[PDB]
Design an enzyme around this catalytic site. Structure first.
Site, short mmCIF file in Angstrom:
data_model
loop_
_atom_site.label_atom_id
_atom_site.label_comp_id
_atom_site.label_asym_id
_atom_site.label_seq_id
_atom_site.Cartn_x
_atom_site.Cartn_y
_atom_site.Cartn_z
N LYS A 136 0.78 -1.29 0.05
CA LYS A 136 -0.07 -0.01 -0.04
C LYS A 136 0.85 1.26 -0.11
O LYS A 136 1.92 1.25 0.64
CB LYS A 136 -0.80 -0.10 1.21
CG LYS A 136 -2.43 -0.72 0.85
CD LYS A 136 -2.51 -1.91 1.63
CE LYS A 136 -3.12 -3.02 0.50
NZ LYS A 136 -4.16 -2.44 -0.12
N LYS A 138 -11.17 -7.98 -12.33
CA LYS A 138 -11.87 -8.74 -11.35
C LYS A 138 -12.97 -9.28 -11.85
O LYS A 138 -13.90 -8.50 -12.42
CB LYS A 138 -11.99 -8.00 -10.17
CG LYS A 138 -10.84 -7.27 -9.48
CD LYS A 138 -11.19 -6.89 -8.27
CE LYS A 138 -9.53 -6.92 -7.40
NZ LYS A 138 -8.89 -5.67 -7.89
#
Length: 340
Positions: free
Chosen positions: A148, A244
């Site tokens: 991140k 996705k």
């Protein structure tokens, strides 16, 4: 060449081994809708939905999806359909509800295909950096690690690179950067970053520095359909696309997108989102066709108990999948009130 004959809705819910903090909500349970479709030959096929309890991530929910599938079944029960292609043309009308579509496609896929056994290269994501976390990554030995974005990213990188093995480095930037950040991003180009996911909320910021200057860019949340992807790939220098199934609307759409973008020069990565072991299998199944390790997370990483036992068990830096068999005892039905 078959008819659809029954539909049971189920629901499932498990503690996360660690709490997940998102902008709008903290997650403690993964609430999850499961369906079961039954043909006229007595066979049971399960689908897992990625929708959540409430609309925090996405406009579709567990309750909203359940309604759409309920109504699709009624329009389409005891229709004869011959092929997989024929079965898929019955969920054309669900295109504007991709989470509902993907749930059904997951079931329909299983009616027409054999389910391989396979392994995929492990891509780890690192939540925050700590001393248990690092000794975990010494043990697991993944081929890619994802970080991140933090203001402390450069330091986090050096902390990570102190592990004794080679890996690939990805940054997730979560649409949060700005002309704040150009200095940081250009310095990152020397740091061998495989790609950075979604640096900017506004995609047009990308031609405000002359490309080659920063690390390869990836689409993730902007990868909303094969169109929108090809548009962005042509207009801007993006080299990686994260696909996705719940976002594109199913396995079939993801498979189409893999094929198209294999020729189109962009690299392709497949990903899921807090999946149980049913959805995880299908995600992984697609993920071995990608150019880099997928956002697929080992069995027993989020959930001690799963509805499919040890789907994605980690062995020697690779995750192992066999055909997913649902533990029907672990599931509870939708409509009732249940202890778990």
């Amino acid at each position: 060449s078959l008819k659809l004959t029954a539909l049971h809705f189920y629901k499932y819910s498990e503690p996360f081994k660690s709490q997940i903090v998102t902008p709008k909500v903290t997650l403690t349970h993964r609430d999850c809708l499961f369906i079961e479709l039954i043909d006229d030959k007595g066979n049971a096929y399960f689908g897992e939905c990625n929708a959540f309890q409430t609309d925090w991530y996405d406009h579709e929910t567990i309750a909203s999806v359940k309604h759409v599938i309920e109504q699709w079944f009624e329009d389409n029960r005891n229709k004869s359909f011959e092929t997989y292609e024929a079965a898929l043309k019955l969920v054309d009308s669900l295109e504007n509800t991709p989470a509902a579509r993907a749930t059904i496609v997951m079931a329909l896929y299983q009616m027409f295909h054999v389910l391989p056994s396979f392994s995929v290269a492990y891509g780890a994501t690192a939540s925050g950096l700590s001393n248990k976390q690092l000794e975990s990554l010494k043990a697991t030995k993944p081929t890619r690690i994802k970080l991140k974005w933090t203001p402390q990213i450069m330091h986090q990188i050096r902390v990570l690179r102190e592990l004794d093995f080679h890996f690939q480095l990805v940054i997730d930037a979560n649409e949060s950067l700005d002309r704040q950040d150009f200095t940081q991003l250009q310095l990152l180009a020397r740091e061998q970053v495989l790609y950075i996911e979604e640096p900017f909320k506004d995609i047009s910021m990308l031609d405000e520095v002359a490309d080659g200057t920063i690390p390869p860019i990836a689409l993730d949340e902007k990868a909303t359909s094969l169109l929108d992807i090809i548009n962005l790939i042509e207009l801007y220098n993006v080299k990686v696309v994260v696909l996705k199934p719940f976002r594109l609307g199913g396995i079939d759409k993801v498979q189409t997108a893999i094929d198209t973008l294999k020729s189109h020069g962009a690299k392709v990565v497949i990903g899921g989102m807090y999946e149980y072991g049913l959805s995880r299998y299908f995600t992984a199944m697609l993920a071995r066709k990608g150019d880099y390790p997928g956002d697929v997370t080992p069995a027993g990483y989020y959930f001690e108990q799963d509805v499919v036992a040890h789907s994605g068990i980690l062995k020697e830096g690779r995750l192992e999948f066999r055909p997913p068999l649902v533990d029907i005892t672990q599931l509870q039905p939708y409509e009732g009130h249940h202890h778990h």
